[PDB]
Amino acid sequence: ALKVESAFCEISGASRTIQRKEAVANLARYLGLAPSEQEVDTFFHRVNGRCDLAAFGRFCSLLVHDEDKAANFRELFLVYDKEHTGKLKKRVVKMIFCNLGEPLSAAEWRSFEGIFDLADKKDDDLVPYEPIVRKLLDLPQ
Amino acid sequence: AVGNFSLPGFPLMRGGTRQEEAKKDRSKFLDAARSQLLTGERRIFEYLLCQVGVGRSVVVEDEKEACGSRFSLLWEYDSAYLEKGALAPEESLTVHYQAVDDSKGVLPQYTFRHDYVVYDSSQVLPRFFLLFEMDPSLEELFAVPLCDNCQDNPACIWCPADAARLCASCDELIHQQNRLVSRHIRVPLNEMPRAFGTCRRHPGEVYELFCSICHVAVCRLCRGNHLHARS
Amino acid sequence: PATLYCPADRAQLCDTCDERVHSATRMLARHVRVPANHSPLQFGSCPYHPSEMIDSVCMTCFVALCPHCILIGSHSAADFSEHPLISTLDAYKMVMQD
Amino acid sequence: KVPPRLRVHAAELETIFTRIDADGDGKLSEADVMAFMKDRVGFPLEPDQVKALLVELSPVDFPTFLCFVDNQLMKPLPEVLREVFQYVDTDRDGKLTAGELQGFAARLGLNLSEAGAAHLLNRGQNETCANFEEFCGLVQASLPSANK
Amino acid sequence: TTSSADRFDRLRDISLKN
Amino acid sequence: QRCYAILEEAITQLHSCTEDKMGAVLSRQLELQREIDTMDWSESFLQYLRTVLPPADFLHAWLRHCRLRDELDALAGDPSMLSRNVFPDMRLQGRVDILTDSALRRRDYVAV
Amino acid sequence: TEEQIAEFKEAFSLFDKDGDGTITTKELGTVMRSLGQNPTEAELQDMINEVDADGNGTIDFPEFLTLMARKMKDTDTEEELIEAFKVFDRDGNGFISAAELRHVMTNLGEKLTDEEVDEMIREADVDGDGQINYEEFVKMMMAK
Amino acid sequence: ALSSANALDAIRRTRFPTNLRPKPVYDSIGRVILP
Amino acid sequence: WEYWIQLSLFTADLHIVGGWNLATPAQQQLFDAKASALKGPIVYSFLDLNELETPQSLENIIAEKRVKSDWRKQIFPSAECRPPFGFEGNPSGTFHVMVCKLALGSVLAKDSEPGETGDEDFKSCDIPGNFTALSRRDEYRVLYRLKRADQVLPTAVLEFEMKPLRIQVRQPVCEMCEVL
Amino acid sequence: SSPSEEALLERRRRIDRELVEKHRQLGQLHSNFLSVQKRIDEASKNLVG
Amino acid sequence: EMHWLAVRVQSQARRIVSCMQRKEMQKVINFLTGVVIFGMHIDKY
Structure with a gap:
């Protein structure tokens, strides 16, 4: 709870309150969490403008989830890889995130390949998804 | 029984790792006190204040061996001290009903409780046939309250600021959260400025003077029934 | 230019960091914040001791006393012990309402 | 550690504002913070990060820069102070002789005596230069603590 | 507290099996 | 079995004596709780008419509302009395003993 | 209707496996069903005529939109799946027993076979105790 | 799947107790709040 | 009677068109004395003519001489009235309401617990012999059920229009000479 | 400040004071009911004992 | 599950941004505090 109280401070400032859309939708990610854009939409709608220390502390505790496992993330690439070779196409990789689920925007996408080494290859290149899953869940590759 | 004895129908809870985590028994105690108004079935306690003269007592174990037909004292020793008997009472927590709201009560x-077995009738002289009244809805003047923030242990420091x-x-935790609050002056609880109190033989107005013959507080209407009214 | 005062914690601390150092728990929330320069530490120096401010006033000898002028001042004698000592803002409001 | 250090240390904290503010209007502006970037550091911070800096600090005022100072020092001390040991050293030997502490921080606009700088480095055995962990200790020792 | 205390609890056990 | 028959007969007496004792007071309390909320509701309509009616309509509506209060005065009554002299007076008395037949022999020797 | 376009591109690339959205004609029926309305078997080959209108051989994004704009049934909405099993909830406990569906909707009903509804019971009842909580099932239906 | 919308149900139906800010002494009009 | 219906509907647009007292003033006094004999007050219930157990029109109740409704199994809306039936088709239309002057006796707040699916507990439960009435907060809406049918004396049928009626206002003229 | 507005306020005080007395009467009747109920529970533990 | 694989991407691609920019901003507060060392080891003497 000391990490929650500390990290809330450097963003809220002296007002002790986050009114910005971006800074409260994101701040739980320093604490180790993954709140969705739809989840923070319901959070900001219930606290309807102000976010205080008590509201953030349970925003961390009610989003601790046991579905961040490698078994559930490998099943997503397993169906698209019907041959079970452990590799998918890079063109398949793009529709999986831009188009499926929440539509990922283009700007944060350009920083995605810069940190996962997917910018230097061409669109139809063969890519593995085991480095994709392990680097995302911060397991050692 | 010589000493502190317990009376049935009284708010009387418990004093005080893997034993302290049952602290929620006090939270349920204050929950039950607020949930129900307690007339507490005030009673018809009829007691005999017996001047029990015990003397040169022999130390004896529990009551089953101090029973007259199995001990047979000498003429010197005259009573039997039940060592591992009685209850040896306890306890701080007690609700009060201060004014129009609940509190607690320390x-x-x-x-203590020391029990003596007496074997002949001339060591017992009854003196008074006391009919007395115990009602929990009255005021409890032995009223040490708890800490406001911590809601836990009995308070003994009052910061006037x-x-x-x-x-x-x-109280340490009150004054360390900021540099500014460390320099609050800290008087003990003792006799903080609260009031002087309204009169009991008639409500409304407060005491003003003192009597000094029968030591009791005197109000503005009280000196007329005071025969020495000066002192 | 400082105007807010806390009567509980004696600190003349307008605006500024009061939004962040005086809003922590249920503790710091109550803490009345009497504004408009209603500060007992603003009536001038003590004429004997020119370092502290007049914040207490005597209601028997009727002299203006700073903390130095009451603790080891002229009013710190043995016979000057039972005299009532109200705050100086309590004194000024008293003259206004008679 | 939300410092009441830097109130006792606000007489020199204020003179930092008078040097970042070239025009001296009481506002540390967008032009004021960029000018402080090139003359003391020299690393060119292009305007979308000097505007980014102004967000968690529109020109920003004296109480709110005190907020930025007192808040990012909450983080543990040896893990944050990292850049000081590597930037004050320009010969990059891991050591900090008294000359470049004087030079770079008088470009930051302050002073020391040669004897005062000598007492910092003379903490027991004949050293004219400090490393990572002992200068971290000199930070805590000279600074009255932020918890009371 | 307020004197007494340490002498009260030592003679509470009046059975002198010492 | 004859234990629990006597004990539930005391329970039935307790619940029946509490039902008509609390019945006189709870009926009066809900009577006055409705009385506060009905007239507070009536003031909410007059506060609405203060902000919505022009001054000519609101004077007529105020004359209407004063008669509305006095008609609620008439259609409320004033029983009081019986709902005030009922007291918390309940107590348990009895003499139940388990006796041997030869104990009943000794009881009759003392008694008639 | 940008939110309805979003439901279009999600189902279209879900059963697509090629790389640029061109899906084969076998799963043109499946992506149409995942929007949430019943098919007719003649409509299947009627879609293929606009699939091979330009000789593409595959289904491509714009002609999927003009196809769906022509053919739009009343889609099933989120709240009425709750009611669709609440009317089956004669018990009032919020639990829908597995065996009560099988008798009631097969002696009644328009187009239902013995094997299709047996798939519906078996996939809904994963614990095997013979009950399906329907709030968890409808959250497993269209929780978006 | 299971916990993703168990979280969505949780955020929807958990009550939010609010932290208490200090009582304002300067009104937005510019006056001083009097008892 | 108009300000009564205005109070019950939160509407400063409703204005009365007429009325019919279907009870003699001597009968109103007899009902008042019976209510005080029951140690209970009188509440006005503003019911729609078609909300009753069996609906009757105005011409039905005048000709047949009886409002033939079992007042025992009947639910009385008090204070807040629902909008009269029809309403949202013709809001500025003419409707009818009937006032049941009811002798509310001893009351029990049934106060249906959270989990209730409707008024099935407020319909089928037997009123205890101690009391003579039941109450329910339906959310200031109170619903009353009376055990007795010698406790509901209907007073008047009132028809109204929903369109405002403003006072004609006359800013003054000079008295001795009506020239300015 | 009409006579009906401060006859309204008199009726506020009269009914509210009577609510305070009736709420204490529910508390005393409920306390006595579970007082005798406790005497039942002690009579059950004693007679069966 | 693709939505949750997407928001782990939203978390991870955001972490790498402030491992640079916050490290540049605590850099700013570091030489600021490190010359609070400088300006008052001298007026003490």
């Missing part, structure tokens, strides 16, 4: 501590009643463990 009763007087440092109790903070306007809060505090025990030692919470």
